[PDB]
Amino acid sequence: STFVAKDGTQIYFKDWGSGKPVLFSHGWILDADMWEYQMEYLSSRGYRTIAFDRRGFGRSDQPWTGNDYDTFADDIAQLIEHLDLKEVTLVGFSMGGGDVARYIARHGSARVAGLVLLGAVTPLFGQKPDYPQGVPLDVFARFKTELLKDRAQFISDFNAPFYGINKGQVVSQGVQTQTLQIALLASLKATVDCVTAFAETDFRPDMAKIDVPTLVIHGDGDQIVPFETTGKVAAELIKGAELKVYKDAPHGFAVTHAQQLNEDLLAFLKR
Amino acid sequence: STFVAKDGTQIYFKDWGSGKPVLFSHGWILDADMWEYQMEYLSSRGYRTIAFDRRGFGRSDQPWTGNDYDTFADDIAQLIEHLDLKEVTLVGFSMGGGDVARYIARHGSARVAGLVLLGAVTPLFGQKPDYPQGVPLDVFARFKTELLKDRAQFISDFNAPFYGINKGQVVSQGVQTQTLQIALLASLKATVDCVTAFAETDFRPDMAKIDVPTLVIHGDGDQIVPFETTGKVAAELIKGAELKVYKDAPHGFAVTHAQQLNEDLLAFLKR
Amino acid sequence: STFVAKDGTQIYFKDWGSGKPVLFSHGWILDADMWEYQMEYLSSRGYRTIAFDRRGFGRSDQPWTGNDYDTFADDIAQLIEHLDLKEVTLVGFSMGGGDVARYIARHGSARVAGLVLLGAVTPLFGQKPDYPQGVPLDVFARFKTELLKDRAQFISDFNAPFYGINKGQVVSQGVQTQTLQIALLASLKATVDCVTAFAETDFRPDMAKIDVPTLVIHGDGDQIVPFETTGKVAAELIKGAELKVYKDAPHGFAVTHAQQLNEDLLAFLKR
Ligand SMILES: [Cl-]
Ligand SMILES: [Cl-]
Ligand SMILES: [Cl-]
Ligand SMILES: [Cl-]
Ligand code: NA
Ligand code: NA
Ligand code: NA
């Protein structure tokens, strides 16, 4: 399915099952297919599951402009309104934690029953003057430099720390191939602009707007989005938030810890 | 090209050349590109060739519902209607043998000149009470179990027994890579639902409704769809059906025996 | 973005940034993504960049008919008129040199500010009776023969002389994988018809019609489109054309010599 965003960008989405809606927002250099197992799992157990390809990724159009969290958050508002969704549970992975958060911050929680943050960049990823513990901006400047020379090899090399293969996680060549294949569908522009977006956007104001039950899940072996300065802090900043830490789990834990995640999501939805 | 099915599912198809129409229905984790060499072969020789991506596969939309043979068969009826095809030769490979059989059973053969069943699951694939010789439903349960853990590696491992590379067939890395790339386009949901469909759907009633010239071709080294309990029996159950057995040919014989197949299809059309 | 050609073929394109327009025409078995670094480079520097997938390639539809240079030139004409582009700089790589030349020959240059021919098949590629220095036509017949047996492995094997990997150039596995992935999106029919087109089409008449500033760039280690009988001659035949020869550069020099190309495009635009 597709809908057309305010600026005319066509966004691809899947809308599966029937029942209370669960809307998934993918990570960086991925697309809606990253969620296929969670979607099948929940939609087979009486839920409606929705997942979109962020502008510039997967099967969506690739605009030059609007590759920023305010627009990502309004793309989500437009999807929710296109489907007239109610009592939605929002699930964001990695950079996708940011746009579900920003959606709540910009539009309020009237349509939202709950929030899940998975290996998420929230509440802030990069360094700020009052957050020297964040990731130094040099690190992200280097992602960009490498992407603007050879994004295909950057993606391939990124699989190892993403999935924690270099620290004894076991992920098949098939998954690594599918990950590269989907990432190559994305716009070069959107891939680079997203670095800018997740490196510098401060979601701490958003945390205080979150007035719905929230579950934060993060792997403490995450080599991409450090648990100590993201998930751990998000869980303290969001009122009433629950935190689950997957022991030694990598960033790419929706694959390495799929069954555990499916079960925790179902548990949260049934709370 | 695309048309929209009754439930709103957008279906991708190609329509090449001019003349009497030949309509192709692809096998399981594949899409319309599996037929590209037969399409080029016949369309350069005075035929019009049409092939679609089944719902949930390739470039088609991925509905949660309708992943069953009555719907697949009605999808084909809608394609035929959309293009207003007359005197069509239907060609089904593997699970696609089932939806062209079911189309004729559901809609009659007034628009149909002929039928070709290639490595096809017809007349019945899995066991029934009067069909213990079928494939045991636990084999299909295991496909599903592995798909629901890691479909990408499942597809990659499927190449060897699909093409018979484990039994001395020679297929390039390029073809193996293309097979995996197309398979990853598909929906996880449709991939698993098709197992249920081809495992349990009985096309024996359908065979009695086939009243057009029919050619059945099967490899007797087919490791995926056993010749003895499928193609051999379909050729006996369809009145006037002709049978060709490709000696030691694997399941993926549209690749390994491409030239022979082209020539057999051309000879059938020129009967 | 998409537009629909006169004959109903949907053609995919990207339209990035704002300012004076620069429209890119890709080579053979590639798509608009081959331009992504040049597009980002220029659109970040005050230009509008447009690139389309040639009919039968990448994300465009796959028509059986119209796979010839006159039609390719008319697709470009419709895109330009569709967007109402003025003072456009046309940039063609390899076989895409021919369709931007043919656009000017067929439609004149009222909308055109400048022309860039990169590793281009212009002014003619294959042998003719007055051009025995051209590539013998049996070389192309053999391309076609191999394509009609196994295009996936042909593409895979083509990467080495395309990028000059067999001759001192260094290109990552990621880039080779992305090249193959994009190439497999294309139509078998379009891939083969394009060989006929670039093998046999004479653009020498077109050269005398080019009445705008023109830059020819070619690698002199080009194993696919030999500099001496193409780019070298094109720069002599077009009045006032500038020639830059990249030393030891292969055919795939938008990859191996990306920065140099970016800077030369920018210099040409600002001349
Ligand atoms: Cl660094
Ligand atoms: Cl744990
Ligand atoms: Cl012949
Ligand atoms: Cl040089
Ligand atoms: Na990510
Ligand atoms: Na199959
Ligand atoms: Na080329």
Side-chain angles (χ1 to χ4, degrees):
Chain A
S1 306
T2 58
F3 72 99
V4 180
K6 192 189 185 215
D7 70 7
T9 300
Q10 174 175 105
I11 304 286
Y12 175 90
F13 70 97
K14 309 192 201 181
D15 179 0
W16 284 357
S18 56
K20 299 300 177 42
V22 187
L23 193 162
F24 291 91
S25 175
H26 67 74
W28 178 53
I29 351 179
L30 298 157
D31 76 7
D33 292 358
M34 76 151 275
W35 299 114
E36 55 203 358
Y37 298 94
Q38 283 74 52
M39 292 181 72
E40 187 278 343
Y41 183 90
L42 296 172
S43 285
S44 282
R45 293 162 172 78
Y47 293 97
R48 178 177 181 192
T49 60
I50 300 103
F52 63 96
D53 292 349
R54 178 171 301 113
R55 63 166 59 213
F57 295 82
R59 294 142 293 210
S60 289
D61 283 353
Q62 305 184 355
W64 179 254
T65 66
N67 300 305
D68 65 75
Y69 271 110
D70 287 345
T71 309
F72 296 156
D74 295 347
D75 289 343
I76 286 170
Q78 292 157 62
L79 176 58
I80 286 172
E81 267 97 295
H82 174 72
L83 301 171
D84 189 28
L85 303 182
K86 293 179 179 181
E87 283 283 277
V88 68
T89 300
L90 299 162
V91 184
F93 172 71
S94 188
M95 73 159 279
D99 54 4
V100 294
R102 184 55 49 95
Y103 161 74
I104 293 167
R106 283 172 70 81
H107 298 271
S109 53
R111 291 174 175 271
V112 180
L115 173 67
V116 187
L117 302 166
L118 307 178
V121 301
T122 46
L124 174 57
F125 191 8
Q127 279 179 342
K128 293 280 185 188
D130 65 325
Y131 212 69
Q133 62 266 49
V135 179
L137 258 18
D138 209 331
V139 167
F140 300 111
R142 178 169 182 168
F143 287 177
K144 288 188 214 183
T145 292
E146 293 168 348
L147 292 156
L148 290 165
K149 289 173 189 173
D150 186 347
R151 89 172 156 114
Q153 195 58 43
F154 180 91
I155 299 155
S156 191
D157 293 345
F158 198 69
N159 279 330
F162 183 94
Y163 292 113
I165 296 165
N166 58 347
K167 294 202 193 304
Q169 300 288 341
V170 178
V171 170
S172 72
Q173 172 69 63
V175 164
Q176 293 176 63
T177 295
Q178 184 184 14
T179 303
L180 175 62
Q181 170 170 325
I182 289 166
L184 294 171
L185 303 176
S187 171
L188 167 69
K189 177 56 166 171
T191 305
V192 174
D193 274 3
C194 280
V195 179
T196 306
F198 62 69
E200 312 208 39
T201 307
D202 193 342
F203 306 98
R204 293 176 288 180
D206 311 44
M207 301 301 92
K209 299 280 190 59
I210 299 159
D211 60 351
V212 295
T214 295
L215 173 62
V216 177
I217 312 191
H218 216 108
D220 67 3
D222 191 326
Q223 298 173 57
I224 305 309
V225 180
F227 165 62
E228 285 294 307
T229 65
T230 60
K232 184 182 143 186
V233 180
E236 289 183 46
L237 286 184
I238 299 172
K239 193 190 179 189
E242 186 192 357
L243 170 67
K244 305 193 204 240
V245 179
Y246 287 4
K247 190 165 113 275
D248 292 332
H251 191 55
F253 76 83
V255 345
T256 64
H257 290 67
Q259 176 177 20
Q260 192 175 355
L261 172 61
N262 291 345
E263 285 166 354
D264 289 335
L265 291 171
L266 184 79
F268 179 74
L269 288 165
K270 282 175 188 333
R271 81 188 164 268
Chain B
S1 308
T2 55
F3 72 97
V4 181
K6 178 183 173 178
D7 72 357
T9 298
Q10 173 177 280
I11 301 301
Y12 181 88
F13 69 96
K14 307 184 196 184
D15 176 4
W16 291 348
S18 58
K20 294 180 181 202
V22 187
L23 188 161
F24 293 93
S25 179
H26 65 78
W28 184 31
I29 342 192
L30 300 159
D31 79 7
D33 290 359
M34 77 155 278
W35 297 114
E36 63 200 1
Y37 302 91
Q38 286 69 52
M39 290 181 68
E40 191 282 334
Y41 184 88
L42 297 167
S43 288
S44 294
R45 289 162 178 77
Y47 296 90
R48 172 182 185 184
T49 56
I50 302 98
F52 63 99
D53 297 347
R54 172 171 304 106
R55 62 172 59 214
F57 296 83
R59 294 145 290 211
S60 291
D61 284 357
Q62 316 184 348
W64 178 257
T65 68
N67 300 309
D68 58 78
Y69 274 106
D70 293 339
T71 306
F72 298 151
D74 294 351
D75 284 351
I76 287 173
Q78 298 192 254
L79 172 51
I80 286 169
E81 302 336 305
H82 180 79
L83 296 183
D84 208 9
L85 304 172
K86 292 165 177 178
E87 290 294 278
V88 58
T89 292
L90 300 169
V91 184
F93 170 73
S94 179
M95 77 163 277
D99 56 4
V100 300
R102 186 56 50 95
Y103 162 76
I104 298 172
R106 278 168 80 77
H107 298 274
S109 59
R111 287 180 178 265
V112 178
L115 176 67
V116 190
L117 297 172
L118 305 178
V121 298
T122 46
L124 174 53
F125 188 15
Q127 293 186 325
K128 295 289 193 185
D130 60 336
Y131 213 68
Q133 61 266 50
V135 186
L137 294 189
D138 59 85
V139 167
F140 302 114
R142 191 148 310 155
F143 280 7
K144 282 194 265 187
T145 300
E146 298 174 342
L147 289 162
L148 291 168
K149 282 174 197 180
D150 184 352
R151 86 173 157 115
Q153 194 58 39
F154 181 96
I155 298 154
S156 187
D157 294 346
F158 205 62
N159 279 333
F162 182 97
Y163 291 113
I165 299 158
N166 61 339
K167 298 217 146 74
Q169 304 290 334
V170 186
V171 177
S172 65
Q173 285 295 310
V175 169
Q176 298 170 59
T177 291
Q178 184 179 22
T179 304
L180 177 60
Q181 174 175 321
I182 289 164
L184 292 167
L185 306 179
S187 166
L188 168 64
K189 171 56 168 174
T191 302
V192 167
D193 269 7
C194 283
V195 181
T196 309
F198 62 62
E200 300 170 1
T201 307
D202 191 347
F203 308 94
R204 288 172 303 171
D206 303 48
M207 303 296 96
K209 284 162 179 179
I210 297 157
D211 62 337
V212 296
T214 292
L215 169 62
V216 177
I217 307 181
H218 216 108
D220 66 10
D222 190 332
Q223 293 173 57
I224 307 307
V225 182
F227 163 61
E228 290 294 312
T229 61
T230 62
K232 185 187 164 57
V233 181
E236 304 188 35
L237 287 182
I238 297 174
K239 205 208 174 188
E242 174 190 6
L243 170 68
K244 287 183 195 276
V245 175
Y246 285 10
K247 188 196 166 56
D248 300 325
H251 194 55
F253 72 88
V255 165
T256 61
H257 291 69
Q259 181 186 346
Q260 187 164 350
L261 172 59
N262 295 342
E263 289 163 2
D264 283 339
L265 294 176
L266 188 67
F268 180 77
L269 294 162
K270 293 185 177 315
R271 69 160 186 298
Chain C
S1 295
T2 56
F3 77 97
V4 183
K6 129 168 258 199
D7 74 0
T9 298
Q10 178 184 90
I11 294 174
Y12 175 94
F13 69 96
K14 311 193 184 173
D15 180 352
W16 286 356
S18 61
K20 301 322 180 80
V22 182
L23 189 156
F24 289 90
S25 178
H26 64 77
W28 177 59
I29 346 188
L30 301 159
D31 73 7
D33 294 357
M34 75 157 276
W35 294 115
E36 64 198 4
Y37 304 89
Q38 285 71 55
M39 296 180 64
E40 190 279 341
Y41 185 85
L42 299 169
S43 288
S44 287
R45 290 167 177 77
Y47 296 91
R48 175 178 179 190
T49 57
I50 302 108
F52 61 99
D53 297 344
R54 181 167 294 108
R55 65 170 52 214
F57 292 84
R59 297 139 293 209
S60 290
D61 286 353
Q62 306 187 357
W64 180 256
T65 59
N67 298 307
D68 62 78
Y69 272 109
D70 289 347
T71 304
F72 298 153
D74 291 353
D75 292 341
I76 286 172
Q78 172 146 326
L79 176 52
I80 284 180
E81 288 165 68
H82 183 75
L83 299 175
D84 194 25
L85 302 183
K86 290 161 172 163
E87 297 297 294
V88 63
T89 297
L90 299 167
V91 181
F93 171 71
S94 182
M95 75 161 280
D99 65 359
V100 295
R102 187 50 58 94
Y103 165 75
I104 291 164
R106 286 171 72 74
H107 299 272
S109 65
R111 279 179 194 274
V112 178
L115 177 59
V116 183
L117 292 170
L118 307 179
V121 300
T122 45
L124 80 170
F125 189 11
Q127 278 190 329
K128 294 284 191 195
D130 62 325
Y131 213 64
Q133 61 261 59
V135 175
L137 296 184
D138 72 7
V139 166
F140 302 115
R142 227 277 186 82
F143 279 9
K144 285 195 245 167
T145 296
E146 290 178 2
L147 288 158
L148 287 164
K149 287 180 181 159
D150 188 347
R151 82 176 164 114
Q153 195 56 43
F154 178 99
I155 296 167
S156 187
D157 291 349
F158 200 68
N159 272 340
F162 184 94
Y163 289 113
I165 285 164
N166 63 337
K167 273 171 161 47
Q169 314 291 332
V170 174
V171 171
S172 69
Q173 287 295 313
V175 165
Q176 298 171 59
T177 291
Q178 183 181 21
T179 306
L180 179 57
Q181 169 168 328
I182 289 172
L184 292 168
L185 307 170
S187 169
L188 170 64
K189 171 68 164 164
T191 301
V192 170
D193 273 0
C194 281
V195 183
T196 307
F198 63 65
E200 307 179 354
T201 303
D202 187 352
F203 306 96
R204 292 176 287 179
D206 304 50
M207 308 289 95
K209 305 279 203 63
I210 296 162
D211 60 338
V212 299
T214 295
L215 167 69
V216 183
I217 311 178
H218 216 108
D220 64 6
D222 191 325
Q223 298 172 55
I224 312 305
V225 183
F227 163 64
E228 290 285 306
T229 64
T230 59
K232 177 173 154 65
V233 181
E236 297 173 22
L237 293 173
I238 296 163
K239 187 160 278 176
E242 185 189 353
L243 168 72
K244 288 182 161 109
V245 176
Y246 284 7
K247 186 189 170 307
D248 307 308
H251 185 60
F253 74 88
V255 164
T256 61
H257 290 64
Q259 179 183 359
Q260 191 166 355
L261 175 65
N262 292 346
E263 286 168 2
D264 287 336
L265 287 173
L266 187 68
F268 183 75
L269 287 164
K270 285 190 186 314
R271 74 191 171 271

mmCIF file of all heavy atoms in Angstrom, chain A residues 142-157:
data_model
loop_
_atom_site.group_PDB
_atom_site.id
_atom_site.type_symbol
_atom_site.label_atom_id
_atom_site.label_comp_id
_atom_site.label_asym_id
_atom_site.label_seq_id
_atom_site.Cartn_x
_atom_site.Cartn_y
_atom_site.Cartn_z
ATOM 1 N N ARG A 142 32.342 10.777 10.268
ATOM 2 C CA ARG A 142 32.976 9.638 9.620
ATOM 3 C C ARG A 142 31.980 8.694 8.933
ATOM 4 O O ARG A 142 32.247 8.262 7.828
ATOM 5 C CB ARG A 142 33.864 8.883 10.603
ATOM 6 C CG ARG A 142 34.512 7.651 10.011
ATOM 7 C CD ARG A 142 35.565 7.131 10.953
ATOM 8 N NE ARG A 142 36.238 5.968 10.398
ATOM 9 C CZ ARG A 142 37.348 5.460 10.919
ATOM 10 N NH1 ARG A 142 37.883 6.031 12.002
ATOM 11 N NH2 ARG A 142 37.909 4.383 10.372
ATOM 12 N N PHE A 143 30.837 8.370 9.538
ATOM 13 C CA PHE A 143 29.819 7.611 8.783
ATOM 14 C C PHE A 143 29.576 8.326 7.441
ATOM 15 O O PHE A 143 29.572 7.690 6.384
ATOM 16 C CB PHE A 143 28.454 7.531 9.494
ATOM 17 C CG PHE A 143 28.404 6.606 10.685
ATOM 18 C CD1 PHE A 143 27.222 6.513 11.427
ATOM 19 C CD2 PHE A 143 29.492 5.803 11.043
ATOM 20 C CE1 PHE A 143 27.122 5.665 12.531
ATOM 21 C CE2 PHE A 143 29.412 4.952 12.168
ATOM 22 C CZ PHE A 143 28.224 4.880 12.903
ATOM 23 N N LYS A 144 29.343 9.641 7.490
ATOM 24 C CA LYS A 144 28.987 10.377 6.275
ATOM 25 C C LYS A 144 30.087 10.327 5.207
ATOM 26 O O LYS A 144 29.829 10.116 4.019
ATOM 27 C CB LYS A 144 28.686 11.828 6.624
ATOM 28 C CG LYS A 144 27.377 11.997 7.347
ATOM 29 C CD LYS A 144 27.087 13.521 7.469
ATOM 30 C CE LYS A 144 26.372 13.842 8.754
ATOM 31 N NZ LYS A 144 26.037 15.313 8.829
ATOM 32 N N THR A 145 31.323 10.513 5.662
ATOM 33 C CA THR A 145 32.490 10.502 4.790
ATOM 34 C C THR A 145 32.574 9.153 4.076
ATOM 35 O O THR A 145 32.756 9.102 2.860
ATOM 36 C CB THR A 145 33.781 10.818 5.619
ATOM 37 O OG1 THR A 145 33.695 12.182 6.039
ATOM 38 C CG2 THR A 145 35.035 10.668 4.777
ATOM 39 N N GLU A 146 32.396 8.080 4.835
ATOM 40 C CA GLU A 146 32.448 6.733 4.281
ATOM 41 C C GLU A 146 31.274 6.460 3.340
ATOM 42 O O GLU A 146 31.477 5.951 2.235
ATOM 43 C CB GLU A 146 32.570 5.691 5.406
ATOM 44 C CG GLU A 146 33.937 5.803 6.130
ATOM 45 C CD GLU A 146 34.016 5.011 7.446
ATOM 46 O OE1 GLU A 146 32.961 4.546 7.952
ATOM 47 O OE2 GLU A 146 35.147 4.866 7.999
ATOM 48 N N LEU A 147 30.063 6.837 3.754
ATOM 49 C CA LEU A 147 28.856 6.716 2.885
ATOM 50 C C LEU A 147 28.999 7.472 1.549
ATOM 51 O O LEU A 147 28.603 6.984 0.500
ATOM 52 C CB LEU A 147 27.581 7.164 3.640
ATOM 53 C CG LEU A 147 27.165 6.231 4.783
ATOM 54 C CD1 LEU A 147 26.315 6.958 5.858
ATOM 55 C CD2 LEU A 147 26.464 4.973 4.252
ATOM 56 N N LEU A 148 29.615 8.644 1.595
ATOM 57 C CA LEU A 148 29.768 9.462 0.403
ATOM 58 C C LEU A 148 30.931 9.040 -0.498
ATOM 59 O O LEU A 148 31.122 9.631 -1.570
ATOM 60 C CB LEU A 148 29.881 10.938 0.797
ATOM 61 C CG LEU A 148 28.595 11.567 1.349
ATOM 62 C CD1 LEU A 148 28.861 12.929 2.077
ATOM 63 C CD2 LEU A 148 27.552 11.718 0.232
ATOM 64 N N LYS A 149 31.716 8.057 -0.053
ATOM 65 C CA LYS A 149 32.694 7.366 -0.924
ATOM 66 C C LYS A 149 32.146 6.041 -1.472
ATOM 67 O O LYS A 149 32.271 5.781 -2.673
ATOM 68 C CB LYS A 149 33.999 7.094 -0.170
ATOM 69 C CG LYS A 149 34.830 8.347 0.099
ATOM 70 C CD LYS A 149 36.012 7.956 1.007
ATOM 71 C CE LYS A 149 36.798 9.175 1.528
ATOM 72 N NZ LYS A 149 37.814 8.737 2.546
ATOM 73 N N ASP A 150 31.506 5.224 -0.612
ATOM 74 C CA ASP A 150 31.058 3.874 -0.999
ATOM 75 C C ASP A 150 30.048 3.344 0.022
ATOM 76 O O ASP A 150 30.416 2.621 0.954
ATOM 77 C CB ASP A 150 32.297 2.915 -1.053
ATOM 78 C CG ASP A 150 31.957 1.507 -1.588
ATOM 79 O OD1 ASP A 150 30.760 1.148 -1.698
ATOM 80 O OD2 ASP A 150 32.900 0.730 -1.906
ATOM 81 N N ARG A 151 28.777 3.698 -0.155
ATOM 82 C CA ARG A 151 27.751 3.306 0.762
ATOM 83 C C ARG A 151 27.504 1.772 0.762
ATOM 84 O O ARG A 151 27.217 1.193 1.804
ATOM 85 C CB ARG A 151 26.451 4.115 0.510
ATOM 86 C CG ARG A 151 25.501 3.504 -0.486
ATOM 87 C CD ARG A 151 24.134 4.265 -0.525
ATOM 88 N NE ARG A 151 23.497 4.045 -1.811
ATOM 89 C CZ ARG A 151 22.371 3.376 -1.990
ATOM 90 N NH1 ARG A 151 21.723 2.863 -0.942
ATOM 91 N NH2 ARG A 151 21.897 3.227 -3.232
ATOM 92 N N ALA A 152 27.638 1.121 -0.395
ATOM 93 C CA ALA A 152 27.431 -0.315 -0.475
ATOM 94 C C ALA A 152 28.422 -1.097 0.433
ATOM 95 O O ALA A 152 28.012 -2.016 1.148
ATOM 96 C CB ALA A 152 27.528 -0.784 -1.929
ATOM 97 N N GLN A 153 29.699 -0.718 0.418
ATOM 98 C CA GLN A 153 30.686 -1.375 1.311
ATOM 99 C C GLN A 153 30.504 -0.934 2.794
ATOM 100 O O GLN A 153 30.673 -1.736 3.721
ATOM 101 C CB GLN A 153 32.124 -1.167 0.805
ATOM 102 C CG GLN A 153 33.186 -2.126 1.476
ATOM 103 C CD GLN A 153 32.824 -3.602 1.260
ATOM 104 O OE1 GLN A 153 32.427 -4.000 0.158
ATOM 105 N NE2 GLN A 153 32.957 -4.415 2.312
ATOM 106 N N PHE A 154 30.145 0.338 3.012
ATOM 107 C CA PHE A 154 29.807 0.778 4.368
ATOM 108 C C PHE A 154 28.716 -0.153 4.939
ATOM 109 O O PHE A 154 28.859 -0.667 6.069
ATOM 110 C CB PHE A 154 29.300 2.238 4.415
ATOM 111 C CG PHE A 154 28.943 2.688 5.811
ATOM 112 C CD1 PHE A 154 29.890 3.298 6.612
ATOM 113 C CD2 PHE A 154 27.671 2.442 6.333
ATOM 114 C CE1 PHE A 154 29.578 3.671 7.942
ATOM 115 C CE2 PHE A 154 27.345 2.817 7.628
ATOM 116 C CZ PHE A 154 28.316 3.436 8.438
ATOM 117 N N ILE A 155 27.625 -0.334 4.192
ATOM 118 C CA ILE A 155 26.531 -1.240 4.614
ATOM 119 C C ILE A 155 26.988 -2.671 4.932
ATOM 120 O O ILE A 155 26.608 -3.210 5.997
ATOM 121 C CB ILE A 155 25.355 -1.299 3.603
ATOM 122 C CG1 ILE A 155 24.713 0.095 3.446
ATOM 123 C CG2 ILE A 155 24.271 -2.310 4.078
ATOM 124 C CD1 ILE A 155 23.988 0.275 2.087
ATOM 125 N N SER A 156 27.794 -3.244 4.033
ATOM 126 C CA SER A 156 28.282 -4.620 4.162
ATOM 127 C C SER A 156 29.091 -4.753 5.461
ATOM 128 O O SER A 156 28.848 -5.677 6.256
ATOM 129 C CB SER A 156 29.150 -4.988 2.947
ATOM 130 O OG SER A 156 29.450 -6.372 2.894
ATOM 131 N N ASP A 157 30.029 -3.817 5.663
ATOM 132 C CA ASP A 157 30.899 -3.774 6.857
ATOM 133 C C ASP A 157 30.130 -3.513 8.135
ATOM 134 O O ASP A 157 30.559 -3.930 9.210
ATOM 135 C CB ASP A 157 32.011 -2.712 6.725
ATOM 136 C CG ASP A 157 33.038 -3.052 5.644
ATOM 137 O OD1 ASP A 157 33.065 -4.191 5.204
ATOM 138 O OD2 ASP A 157 33.788 -2.163 5.203
#
